[PDB]
Amino acid sequence: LKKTSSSGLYKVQIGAFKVKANADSLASNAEAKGFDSIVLLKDGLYKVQIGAFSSKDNADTLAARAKNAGFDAIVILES
């Protein structure tokens, strides 16, 4: 009953495209490294996020891993 403060989220993102099939191939690349990929359809485009945690340190390690993995991952704090 009411626990853990909610304020912002640290998730990693390697890209977004108007095509879901493209957002699926991307999410697949991240999966290879072993990241939790996700495709969210926004009013016009599809986003590909990989690795979501409560601590930014997590997103950073993921992101950099994506870069080293061959993907342009970035960390963003969404509230």
The answer to whether the CB of 62 falls within 8 A of the CB of 50 is yes
Structure tokens at 36: 């939790």
Sheet holding 9-17, edge to edge: 37-42, 45-53, 9-17, 74-78
Quick check: 40 and 47 in contact, CB under 8 A? yes
How far is CA 5 from each of CA 8, 52, 56, rounded to the nearest angstrom?
A: 10, 16, 15
How is domain 8-79 classified at the architecture level of CATH? 2-Layer Sandwich (3.30)
Q: How was this structure determined?
A: NMR
- Alpha carbons 27 and 12: distance in angstroms, whole number: 11
Q: CB atoms < 10 A from the CB of 36, how many?
A: 15
Which residues fall within 8 angstroms of residue 1, CB to CB, at 6 or more apart?
Answer: none
